[model samples]
Target: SLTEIEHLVQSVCKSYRETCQLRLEDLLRQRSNIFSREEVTGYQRKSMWEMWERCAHHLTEAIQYVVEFAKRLSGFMELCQNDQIVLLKAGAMEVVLVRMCRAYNADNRTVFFEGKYGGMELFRALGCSELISSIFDFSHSLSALHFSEDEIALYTALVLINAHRPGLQEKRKVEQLQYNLELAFHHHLHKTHRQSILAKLPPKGKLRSLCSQHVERLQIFQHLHPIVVQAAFPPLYKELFS
Candidate 1:
């Protein structure tokens, strides 16, 4: 018989498999059909402002998916509302970055952006080429690990359930939840003979630094293009990034 934590882990994995859709491909395909009359030239340059808007919109949608996944993690909903918000505010972007690995195509070193596969050069208009390169590198490294969906789910849950997120009124409760997740994760790894893979995984510090870099780049972009940031960035994205 499985332990309670094991069952919770199983359900968490199932939720992730079901809810996490790699539908960006499908979305782009549909839109391409709608605009088929337009010439589909390879690498046609779009306006920088237009590209930024599109990227921001897609990122906002991805964040929504991360929030949904977090809610399905066992014990997440039981956290106080304030703590829940704090956790999401602190960790949602990290989960988003992790999930990006799924969409990353390691073969060509490109990421799926705005319904197309794009290398770092494709996003030069965003004025954050360094950040884009870092994101691509991070995605490539994570994809090389070849984590299964269950592993990814457990990892994402751990990212969101951190006990040390500042402003948590009930750190003890959060710590207990994290402990359960760690046990479940370890048990899964042991059963799968992947114990050694733990050390190879990128540390949380790397993800934190990448997130801070993202924020820093966003600040620069906002300063340079205040009108687009004000007019086009989604409210949820603005709220979180602010």
Candidate 2:
């Protein structure tokens, strides 16, 4: 049997790697800022965009390569002692998930399994609604997104507003981010249902449906990233033993 711990690390690490890379373009978008800021005037404070560029540039210099930095972080995870089970979960998993999915849709897909932890499997085996209720109870105060401190009010506003509406799940921690974003940003919106918000997002003309294409590429290439650099790459499925 796979230890609950190993299963957990595998699941979280996989989801993180996929989502982080998925949204990389959206999250990584930037202009060449070197020319954006010229000589500073006496009282000119840095604009947020300029400041972010400086921060990113500093990070780039410090790490040299983002892919290599990811490798080092995976090594740190590998170094963690499993005896301290609670800390690995209640402490580390949340940060890992957030950083991972920053490049993904950030909604329904992210926490659904882990939020239930052992409950979902137990429920499936027994046909129980208790697991669902248990998850709700556990996640009640937790942001449908950020699980703990460093909780930014601005960041969470989108999740909260969408929590009330019926809509497609984002599979992110904030299940209703698109809904919530509509609520907070679109003055034209006031309907209480999620369908309303979704209907309102402007249509994009047909571009090549590359969703499956990229997904295929990533599925094969994901191992090039470090968290999964183990021979367990295809980690053995236990049914073989059974």
Alpha-carbon RMSD, each predicted model: 4.8, 21.1
Measured by TM-score, the strongest candidate is: 1
Stretches of candidate 2 above 4 Å error? Answer: 1-126, 144-242
The count of residue-pair clashes in candidate 1 stands at 0
Which 10 residues in a row give candidate 1 its minimum summed lDDT? 34-43
In model 1, the clashing pairs are none
lDDT of each: 0.76, 0.28
The backbone clash count of each candidate, in order, is 0, 10
Q: List the residue pairs that clash in candidate 2.
A: 23-103, 106-172, 107-170, 107-171, 107-172, 108-170, 108-171, 108-172, 109-171, 144-173
**How do the residues 1-242 of candidate 2 rate in per-residue lDDT, one tens digit apiece?**
22433443343334334433223343334211111122222113544344334423332232222222222322223322321122222222223222332322222222222112122222232222453343333343233343211121112222222232233132342333334333333321222232343342212211011222322332333333212122211111111111
Indicate the residue-level lDDT of 138 in model 1: 98
User: 1-242 in candidate 1: lDDT tens per residue?
Assistant: 36797797888897787667674345334332321113223223677776666776666666677878887888888988778888887888888899888777777776665555666776666666788889999999998988777888998889989999889999998998899889989999999998887998998799999988886665665566643333232433445554
